Structure 1
Amino acid sequence: EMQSLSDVMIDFEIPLGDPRDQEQYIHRKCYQEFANCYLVKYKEPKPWPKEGLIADQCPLPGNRQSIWDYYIKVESIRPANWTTKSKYGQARLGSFYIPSSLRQINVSHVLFCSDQLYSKWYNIENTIEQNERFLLNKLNNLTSGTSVLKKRALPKDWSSQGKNALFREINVLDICSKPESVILLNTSYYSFSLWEGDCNFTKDMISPYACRFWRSKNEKEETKCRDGETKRCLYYPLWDSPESTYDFGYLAYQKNFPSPICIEQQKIRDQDYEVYSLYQECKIASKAYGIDTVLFSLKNFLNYTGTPVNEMPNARAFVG
């Protein structure tokens, strides 16, 4: 539609000043490009510690969930002398494997561009032109001449002085919808287990589903073939398969029935984060160097990894 219009209209000089010099042009261009884009800096670099993730709150496949991208499936047919330890390290087959790309040792900052961590001030029920003004005020109120947010803005998890002025707090079900967010930003790993063995919880020690563990431990891991130790051989798993049930932990979490839930905390990162605003840096830098330069400069910073963060899907746009 745009090209067709472009193809029949020559240019005309109009005797007013250059839009590039007008505030309303600078403010609405920085907004349309960088409104919800932020940069977070760890106190020092520390990655997510394990390659396996126990997270029973998420319903398994049997709506589509984002975490299913990291879900190890239990297969009945395997090759001869096949073991999890060969492929997925110390992960429990039928749970979730975290790749080494999301666990880099040298990553110091996290860059994200989404409107899905804002506290209650933000509502999609309200009007775009309101939700603009609301943000534009808050960012002016929470800043002072630089692009660094005031500690008040952060949630209580990321800072001692945080009061959720801008951002909400990450909850237990957020891992299912927004995996990378949690793995890159959470200060501590909390587990959620209905697996028989964890926290030394024995089947006797309990003082349709009712009081029962989801996955019970079998004798050992083994395969067997019939003169064809290559392609197709039966596999006997070290735990059970949740294909039949697939709602157990999700229904348990919401408390429809009582069950022996296990939860253990493990500290990853210090609660002393620092957060910059790319919308406020665009406004401030454009007053000195002019928007044409600043726009081009900050658009490259969004492509620091090789994939531009602003063109990723809204829930999955988190990069280290």
Structure 2
Amino acid sequence: EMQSLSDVMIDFEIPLGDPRDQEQYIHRKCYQEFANCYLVKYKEPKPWPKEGLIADQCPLPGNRQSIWDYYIKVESIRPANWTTKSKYGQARLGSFYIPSSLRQINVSHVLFCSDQLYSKWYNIENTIEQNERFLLNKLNNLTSGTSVLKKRALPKDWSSQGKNALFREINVLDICSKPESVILLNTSYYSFSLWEGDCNFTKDMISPYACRFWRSKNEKEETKCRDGETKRCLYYPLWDSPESTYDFGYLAYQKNFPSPICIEQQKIRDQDYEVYSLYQECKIASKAYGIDTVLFSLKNFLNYTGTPVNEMPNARAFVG
């Protein structure tokens, strides 16, 4: 549609000043490009510690969930002398494997561009032109001449002085919808287990589903073949398969029935984060160097990894 219009209209000089010099042009261009884009800096670099993730709150496949991208499936047919330890390290087959790309040792900052961590001030029920003004005020109120947010803005998890002025707090079900967010930003790993063995919880020690563990431990891991130790051989798993049930932990979490839930905390990162606003840096830098330069400069910073963060899907746009 745009090209067709472009192809029949020559240019005309109009005797007013250059839009590039007008505030309303600078403010609405920085907004349309960088409104919800932020940069977070760890106190020092520390990655997510394990390659396996126990997270029973998420319903398994049997709506589509984002975490299913990291879900190890239990297969009946395997090759001869096949073991999890060969492929997925110390992960429990039928749970979730975290790749080494999301666990880099040298990553110091996290860059994200999404409107899905804002506290209650933000509502999609309200009007775009309101939700603009609301943000534009808050960012002016929470800043002072630089692009660094005031500690008040952060949630209580990321800072001692945080009061959720801008951002909400990450909850237990967020891992299912927004995996990378949690793995890159959470200060501590909390587990959620209905697996028989964890926290030394024995089947006797309990003082349709009712009081029962989801996955019970079998004798050992083994395969067997019939003069064809290559392609197709039966596999006997070290735990059970949740294909039949697939709602157990999700229904348990919401408390429809009582069950022996296990939860253990493990500290990853210090609660002393620092957060910059790319919308406020665009406004401030454009007053000195002019928007044409600043726009081009900050658009490259969004492509620091090789994939531009602003063109990723809204829930999955988190990069280290």
- 1:286 CA drift (Å): 0.0
Q: Matched residue pairs, number?
A: 320
Q: Give the distance between the partners of 1:71 and 1:195, measured in 2 at CA.
A: 16
RMSD: 0.0
Cα deviation 1:119-142 (Å, max 9, x = unaligned): 000000000000000000000000
Q: CA deviation at 1:236?
A: 0.0
CA distance in 2, matches of 1:111, 1:163: 22
1:272 match: 272
Q: What's the offset of the Cα at 1:72? A: 0.0
Shift of 1:228: 0.0
Q: 1: CA distance between counterparts of 2:195 and 2:158?
A: 30
Distance, in Å, in 2 between the alignment partners of 1:71 and 1:140 is: 42
TM-superposed deviation, 1:303: 0.0
CA distance in 1, matches of 2:208, 2:232: 36
Runs of 4+ in 1 over 2 A off after TM superposition: none
Q: Tell me the distance in 1 between the aligned counterparts of 2:140 and 2:37.
A: 16
Aligned partners of 1:87 and 1:209: how far apart in 2?
Answer: 33
Shift of 1:287: 0.0
Deviations along 1:145-201, whole A, 9 cap, x unmatched? Answer: 000000000000000000000000000000000000000000000000000000000
SS in structure 1 at match of 2:119: coil
Q: Match of 2:39, SS?
A: strand
Quick one: distance in 2 between partners of 1:201 and 1:78?
Answer: 31
Quote how far apart the aligned CAs of 1:206 are.
Answer: 0.0
2:79 counterpart residue number = 79
Structure 1: any 5+ residue segments left out of the alignment?
none
Deviation at 1:40, TM superposition (A): 0.0
Alignment partner, residue 9 of structure 1: 9
Measured against aligned partners, the alpha-carbon deviations of 1:239-270 in whole angstroms (never above 9, x if no partner) come to 00000000000000000000000000000000
Deviation readout 1:82-123 (Å, 9 max, x if unpaired) = 000000000000000000000000000000000000000000
Distance in 1 between residues matched to 2:83 and 2:272, nearest whole Å? 41
Which secondary structure does the structure 2 equivalent of 1:56 belong to? coil
- In structure 2, C-alpha distance between the alignment counterparts of 1:43 and 1:316, rounded to whole Å: 24
Q: CA deviation at 1:307?
A: 0.0
Report the Cα distance in structure 2 between the residues aligned to 1:112 and 1:151, rounded to whole angstroms. 18
Deviation at residue 39 of structure 1 after TM alignment: 0.0
Partner Cα separation in structure 2 for residue 234 and residue 48 of structure 1: 35
1:4 shift after superposition: 0.0
Q: 1:128 & 1:309 partners in 2: Cα distance? A: 22
Give the match's secondary structure for 1:249. helix
Return the alpha-carbon distance in structure 1 between the equivalents of residues 167 and 175 of structure 2.
Answer: 17
SS of 1:139's partner is helix
Q: Distance in 2 between matches of 1:90 and 1:269?
A: 22
For residues 224-246 of structure 1, what are the alpha-carbon distances to aligned partners after superposition, in whole Å with 9 as ceiling and x for unaligned?
00000000000000000000000
Who is 2:191 aligned against? 191
3-state DSSP class of the match of 1:251? helix
What are the superposed Cα offsets for residues 4-33 of structure 1, whole Å, 9 maximum, x if unpaired?
000000000000000000000000000000
The DSSP-based 3-state class of the residue aligned with 2:12 is: coil
- 2:237 corresponds to which residue? 237
